[PDB]
Design an enzyme around this catalytic site. Structure first.
Site, PDB file in Angstrom:
ATOM      1  NE  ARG A 220       2.131  -9.107   5.966  1.00  0.00           N
ATOM      2  CZ  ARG A 220       0.815  -9.025   5.800  1.00  0.00           C
ATOM      3  NH1 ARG A 220      -0.008  -9.763   6.558  1.00  0.00           N
ATOM      4  NH2 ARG A 220       0.314  -8.205   4.866  1.00  0.00           N
TER       5      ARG A 220
ATOM      6  CD  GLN B 222      -0.941  -9.073   0.267  1.00  0.00           C
ATOM      7  OE1 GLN B 222      -0.913  -7.945  -0.258  1.00  0.00           O
ATOM      8  NE2 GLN B 222      -1.292  -9.257   1.528  1.00  0.00           N
TER       9      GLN B 222
ATOM     10  CG  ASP C 126      -1.976  -5.870  -2.448  1.00  0.00           C
ATOM     11  OD1 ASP C 126      -3.132  -5.800  -2.011  1.00  0.00           O
ATOM     12  OD2 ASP C 126      -1.070  -5.118  -2.055  1.00  0.00           O
TER      13      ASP C 126
ATOM     14  CG  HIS D  10      -5.942  -1.827   1.624  1.00  0.00           C
ATOM     15  ND1 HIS D  10      -4.614  -1.773   1.817  1.00  0.00           N
ATOM     16  CD2 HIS D  10      -6.453  -0.615   2.091  1.00  0.00           C
ATOM     17  CE1 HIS D  10      -4.291  -0.576   2.382  1.00  0.00           C
ATOM     18  NE2 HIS D  10      -5.409   0.120   2.553  1.00  0.00           N
TER      19      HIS D  10
ATOM     20  CB  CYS E 101      -0.974   0.080   1.183  1.00  0.00           C
ATOM     21  SG  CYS E 101      -1.152  -1.445   2.098  1.00  0.00           S
TER      22      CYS E 101
ATOM     23  CE  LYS F  23      -8.907  -7.788   8.482  1.00  0.00           C
ATOM     24  NZ  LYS F  23      -7.744  -8.631   8.124  1.00  0.00           N
TER      25      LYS F  23
ATOM     26  CG  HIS G 173      -3.677  -0.800  -2.409  1.00  0.00           C
ATOM     27  ND1 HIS G 173      -2.581  -1.541  -2.696  1.00  0.00           N
ATOM     28  CD2 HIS G 173      -3.959  -1.007  -1.064  1.00  0.00           C
ATOM     29  CE1 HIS G 173      -2.168  -2.145  -1.584  1.00  0.00           C
ATOM     30  NE2 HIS G 173      -3.016  -1.814  -0.587  1.00  0.00           N
TER      31      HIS G 173
HETATM   32  C1  LIG Z   1      -5.097  -6.766   0.835  1.00  0.00           C
HETATM   33  C2  LIG Z   1      -3.894  -5.835   0.965  1.00  0.00           C
HETATM   34  O1  LIG Z   1      -3.961  -4.790  -0.016  1.00  0.00           O
HETATM   35  C3  LIG Z   1      -3.725  -5.216   2.353  1.00  0.00           C
HETATM   36  N1  LIG Z   1      -2.868  -4.034   2.210  1.00  0.00           N
HETATM   37  C4  LIG Z   1      -3.150  -6.272   3.273  1.00  0.00           C
HETATM   38  O2  LIG Z   1      -1.947  -6.501   3.302  1.00  0.00           O
HETATM   39  N2  LIG Z   1      -4.055  -6.958   4.007  1.00  0.00           N
HETATM   40  S1  LIG Z   1      -3.783  -8.235   4.999  1.00  0.00           S
HETATM   41  O3  LIG Z   1      -2.406  -8.622   5.147  1.00  0.00           O
HETATM   42  O4  LIG Z   1      -4.248  -7.950   6.316  1.00  0.00           O
HETATM   43  C5  LIG Z   1      -4.554  -9.540   4.470  1.00  0.00           C
HETATM   44  C6  LIG Z   1      -4.227 -10.120   3.231  1.00  0.00           C
HETATM   45  C7  LIG Z   1      -4.897 -11.269   2.780  1.00  0.00           C
HETATM   46  C8  LIG Z   1      -5.889 -11.861   3.568  1.00  0.00           C
HETATM   47  C9  LIG Z   1      -6.210 -11.279   4.817  1.00  0.00           C
HETATM   48  C10 LIG Z   1      -7.245 -11.917   5.680  1.00  0.00           C
HETATM   49  C11 LIG Z   1      -7.077 -11.905   7.081  1.00  0.00           C
HETATM   50  C12 LIG Z   1      -8.016 -12.522   7.923  1.00  0.00           C
HETATM   51  C13 LIG Z   1      -9.123 -13.160   7.336  1.00  0.00           C
HETATM   52  N3  LIG Z   1     -10.210 -13.832   7.768  1.00  0.00           N
HETATM   53  N4  LIG Z   1     -11.007 -14.255   6.670  1.00  0.00           N
HETATM   54  C14 LIG Z   1     -10.479 -13.867   5.489  1.00  0.00           C
HETATM   55  C15 LIG Z   1      -9.293 -13.178   5.874  1.00  0.00           C
HETATM   56  C16 LIG Z   1      -8.338 -12.558   5.078  1.00  0.00           C
HETATM   57  C17 LIG Z   1      -5.541 -10.126   5.266  1.00  0.00           C
END
Ligand SMILES: C[C@@H](O)[C@H](N)C(=O)NS(=O)(=O)c1cccc(-c2ccc3n[nH]cc3c2)c1
Ligand SMILES: C[C@@H](O)[C@H](N)C(=O)NS(=O)(=O)c1cccc(-c2ccc3n[nH]cc3c2)c1
Lengths: 402, 395
Positions: free
Chosen positions: A122, A140, A142, A270, A93, A223, A144
């Site tokens: 990470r 990912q 990914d 995101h 991001c 989210k 935005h």
């Molecule tokens: C999506 C990206 O643009 C964002 N900047 C990010 O890194 N998000 S994240 O690391 O927190 C992330 C990425 C992928 C999945 C999840 C996530 C985390 C927890 C979940 N529970 N059910 C579905 C879920 C999905 C979180």
């Protein structure tokens, strides 16, 4: 069953102690990795998502600006360079924000959808790391979305629809969750309540039942979290849709609005569908138990000569499928019967076994057998290639060769 | 004339102080980036190369085993994790050695060619950093060929052929240098001599004038180095074919013939996608050939009554699948939109008026302002596919 075991046995991927939480993808595994990316890219091309490439390493000051340093420092790999602190990116991001901010933006560009397959790092704990499921390195799918306030509703609808079509190619259903402000949050509690309200509304206007994940939002916004159900019965946390009013304030992001309104702040959604390629390979390896559908299969075609006089012709057929972009192998081993070899290729999970004897050599044809032991008989090399290209292009389930 | 300026003006890429030596590729630059990887990929498929994905961070012990910690320490970014020392990879070779070593190897699977586009990092001094030329992060079109002793000759021939065919697509000539052992190498002088003799030999089997280049070899092997000459006449160092007998010893690599050592050939052709992008941005002066251009088609209606038809045309080129844009702006004349598109470097402008809408055709103007007449959509699509598939230059 177990992705680590299947990935090892099928020669897809392995893990080594000299790089814990990362993966070594062998040729057959890298094929699956790249096919998943190509699948996503092909959807991006019909949905106005534009791929970008960003740095992996950034000055700590970026992370300070984005509030990652404050909220997320536990999880980053930092080192020093000419007396300044740097860190490997855990998320794309902040880079994307610099990209939005690089030149003045107009409302006419909105929504601007920036996609990135860049590698993230990470710092998970040694003893928590496992296979492709909990890792240090991942990519990912990914993106935005930078959009106006009035576009939020349509874009969130867009994300859910995209997510439905993606998981329907695998044959997966899914369930929805709403994740609320955590402790360790950024900005205003009243702004967060607007953000939570909008996600709630988007959830109710979409078809489906949903539950509350109280306090599980990111530090930058609430989210929609999507768990996928695989064909066995397991739910996996894969996808997110995250509504971010906070980073645009952090980065002082603005765009030129309709003339003559004043500049406004873009909103950021995101999202990720697959979640990470690594997580998704894990899931799929276990879901199909190694029985890959054709478009994902790193064992698409096994060519089997009837006897050693047809070896060179088998090599030619195999090269032809290879050159037409299929994962095609050959079994020349004279020590076993034709039926044994067919059976082996079938147990090793090849979708199509192409048998080649004298009569097939003489006429430029192949004798087609499937994985589940269906006989389709004789077809030319070119027509077989053509029909297999359709099955791959459309990402189907190959008991449909007719 | 400078890739930084062209990159900025064309919205391909830019640089930021918060990440010196790394590039931000905007969508149109990212398009170019991937088209280059794609081009290389399609050659790999034709030449028995197999792509792999490897980690980016490795425990320091691997760099000790490889000989990188002793010889390349300063050039590397390192950090601690749970009381142990890790570093970002500056090269893919050690990961590939691990992969080759993962299970016993049979002479029948050799030559085994592992290709990898992974992100590499090397620690360049800040005062020596410039655009895409001297950088800290890059992706090489890297590969390592694992082969038998008696296979070296053909593989190096193959590496030469691969080289010629790629550079011929760009239109570049090239010259060959031999890089001799440096100071601060590993292994026996004797073996080195043996490796230098094979590079010398293959270097004039490939009947081309070649230069000596004393002590510029890698710490693990002598190199055939290759500079390409671009259209402006400038030479650039890109390709390298490196013959490595040392890493097999270091990694205790064997294969079943009994049990012998593999030979490693390190090889890259583009060098880095980054570097080749700088070279191509300058080489053309910004004028991308069609297969590389992220601005392939601009659709322009003649007036507002043809907006919907122009939309439909642009969508057909997009679906077919070109980088196709549209200019609906009602406050620019037809001639201004054409001029603009050409200055933005679009390869073809598709003019769509009332005649065209009725006929399901397009009226095409080239980048350099030549008329190509009225053409059916589907014949224009076929043409542009030819131009793309065959990676056509200026003919
Ligand atoms: C999506 C990206 O643009 C964002 N900047 C990010 O890194 N998000 S994240 O690391 O927190 C992330 C990425 C992928 C999945 C999840 C996530 C985390 C927890 C979940 N529970 N059910 C579905 C879920 C999905 C979180
Ligand atoms: C192939 C890999 O296994 C190797 N570890 C590598 O990264 N090689 S390299 O960093 O030394 C490298 C990569 C690309 C180009 C060059 C290079 C270096 C010097 C040159 N002079 N003329 C052409 C030249 C090319 C070197």
């Amino acid at each position: 069953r177990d992705h680590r075991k299947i990935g090892r046995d099928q020669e897809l991927y392995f893990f080594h102690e000299l790089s814990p939480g990362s993966c070594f993808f062998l040729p057959k595994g890298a094929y699956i990795y790249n096919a998943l990316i190509e699948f996503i890219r092909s959807e991006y091309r019909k949905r106005g998502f534009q791929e970008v490439v960003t740095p992996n390493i950034f000055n700590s000051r970026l992370w300070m600006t984005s509030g990652h340093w404050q909220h997320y420092s536990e999880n980053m790999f930092s080192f020093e360079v000419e007396k300044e602190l740097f860190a490997l990116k855990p998320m794309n991001c902040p880079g994307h924000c610099l990209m939005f901010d690089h030149r003045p933006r107009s409302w006419r560009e909105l929504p601007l959808r920036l996609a990135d397959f860049g590698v993230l790092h990470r710092n998970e704990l040694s003893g928590a790391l496992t296979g492709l499921t909990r890792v240090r390195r991942f990519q990912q799918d990914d993106a935005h979305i930078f959009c106006a306030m009035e576009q939020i509703e349509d874009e969130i609808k867009g994300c859910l629809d995209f997510l439905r079509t993606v998981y329907s190619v695998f044959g997966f259903s899914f369930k929805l969750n709403l994740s609320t402000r955590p402790e360790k949050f950024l900005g205003d509690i009243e702004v967060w309540d607007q953000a939570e309200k909008q996600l709630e509304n988007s959830l109710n206007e979409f078809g489906e039942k949903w539950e509350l994940n109280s306090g599980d939002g990111a530090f930058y916004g609430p989210k929609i979290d999507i768990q996928i159900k695989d064909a066995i019965g397991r739910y996996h946390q894969c996808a997110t849709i995250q509504l971010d009013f906070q980073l645009p304030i952090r980065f002082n992001l603005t765009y030129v609005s309709h003339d003559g309104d004043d500049k406004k702040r873009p909103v950021i959604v995101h999202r990720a569908i697959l979640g990470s390629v690594e997580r998704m390979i894990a899931i799929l390896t276990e879901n199909y138990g190694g029985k890959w559908p054709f478009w994902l299969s790193p064992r698409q075609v096994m060519v089997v000569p009837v006897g050693p006089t047809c070896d060179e012709y088998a090599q030619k057929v195999r090269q032809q499928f290879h050159d037409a972009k299929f994962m095609a192998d050959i079994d020349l081993d004279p020590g076993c019967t034709l039926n044994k070899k067919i059976r082996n290729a079938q147990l090793a999970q090849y979708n199509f076994i192409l048998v080649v004897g004298e009569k097939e050599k003489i006429s430029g044809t192949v004798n087609i057998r499937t994985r589940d032991n269906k006989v389709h008989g004789e077809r030319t090399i070119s027509e077989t290639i053509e029909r297999l290209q359709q099955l791959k292009e459309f990402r189907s389930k190959q008991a449909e060769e007719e």
